[PDB]
Amino acid sequence: HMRYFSTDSPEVKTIVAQDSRLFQFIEIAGEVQLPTKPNPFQSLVSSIVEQQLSIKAASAIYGRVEQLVGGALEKPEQLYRVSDEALRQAGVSKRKIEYIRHVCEHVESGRLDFTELEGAEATTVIEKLTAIKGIGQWTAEMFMMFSLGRLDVLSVGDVGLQRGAKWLYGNGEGDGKKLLIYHGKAWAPYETVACLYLWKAAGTFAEEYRSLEELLHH
């Protein structure tokens, strides 16, 4: 499922209410989007496969895992039937295999129930997720956004968001981490939506303009 936020969405209106710099930016940048992966377990496994690899690299390895399970990876039970040597021959590293196994353990033991989590404060979700080997804070945070579609997430550690923060609130200078913590307070409870714009600022706009200030020379 793919989800769009227009410049006149109530979420966007909320995040800009007490931030005119963000407002000035959003009126130029237009809509943002939020991809939502249907299947949570599938997403976690895919997230582990991606670590340290290009989208091209990871896609090759994951394609081969799908063949081992005989189609879409949907359910942890599918991996019981696939050995570790098999996964290694497919190119999944030994560490990534331990992480994937740990995800399975946590889904099938019931520790990690995704329906109860759609409901929990962000603080709790991040706990339940980072309990899994291989899943760090950042990983949990990206997972909450791009897979559980949660709009109240601010990944302070994202170098992307940090780059956007400096651009939008420094003059392309200053401490992205600190800027992001400070200005982020203005966006509750739709922080994820701001983050989409920060990412947008970090990409195309960062490349063509020093700061938000420069862009406002029409």
Rounded distance between C-alpha atoms, residue 51 and residue 92, angstroms? 11
Copy the structure tokens of residue 148. 């559980």
204/214 same-domain check:
yes
Rounded distance between C-alpha atoms, residue 9 and residue 18, angstroms? 16
Rounded distance between C-alpha atoms, residue 48 and residue 2, angstroms? 22
Rounded distance between C-alpha atoms, residue 124 and residue 116, angstroms? 11
Identify the domain boundary among 133, 150, 167: 150
Copy the structure tokens of residue 84. 């570790």
32/43 same-domain check:
no
- With contact defined as beta carbons under 8 Å apart, do 96 and 69 qualify? no
Give the DSSP letter string of 61-119.
Answer: HHHHHHHHHTS----THHHHTS-HHHHHHTT--HHHHHHHHHHHHHHHTTSS-HHHHBT
Rounded distance between C-alpha atoms, residue 159 and residue 74, angstroms? 31
CA–CA distances in Å: residue 188 to residues 72, 153, 195, 211: 36, 9, 12, 24
What is the SS3 assignment for 218?
coil
Kind plus residue range of the DSSP H or E element containing 208: helix 206-208
120/73 same-domain check:
yes
Identify the domain boundary among 125, 150, 175: 150
Domain that holds residue 31: 1-36+151-218
41/146 same-domain check:
yes
59/108 same-domain check:
yes
- 191-200 vs 176-184: helix crossing angle, rounded to 10: 140
Catalytic residues, by residue number, are: 158
Give the DSSP letter string of 131-196.
Answer: TSTT--HHHHHHHHHHTT--S----TT-HHHHHHHHHHHSSS-S-HHHHHHHHHGGGTT-HHHHHH
**What φ, ψ does residue 209 adopt, rounded to 5°?**
-140, 145
The widest CA-to-CA distance across the chain, in whole angstroms, is: 61
Identify the domain boundary among 150, 171, 190: 150
Q: Is the dihedral of CA 73, 78, 82, 84 positive or negative?
A: positive
CA–CA distances in Å: residue 55 to residues 46, 107, 133, 137: 11, 26, 22, 21
Total number of domains constituting the chain: 2
95/126 same-domain check:
yes
Experimental technique, in short, is X-ray
Report the CATH number at residue 5.
1.10.1670.40
Report the CATH number at residue 123.
1.10.340.30
Closest by Cα among 13, 10, 64, 71 to 39 = 71
136/217 same-domain check:
no
Nearest 5°: CA angle at 163, between 158 and 24? 115
Copy the structure tokens of residue 73. 């990876």
175/133 same-domain check:
no
141/209 same-domain check:
no
127/140 same-domain check:
yes
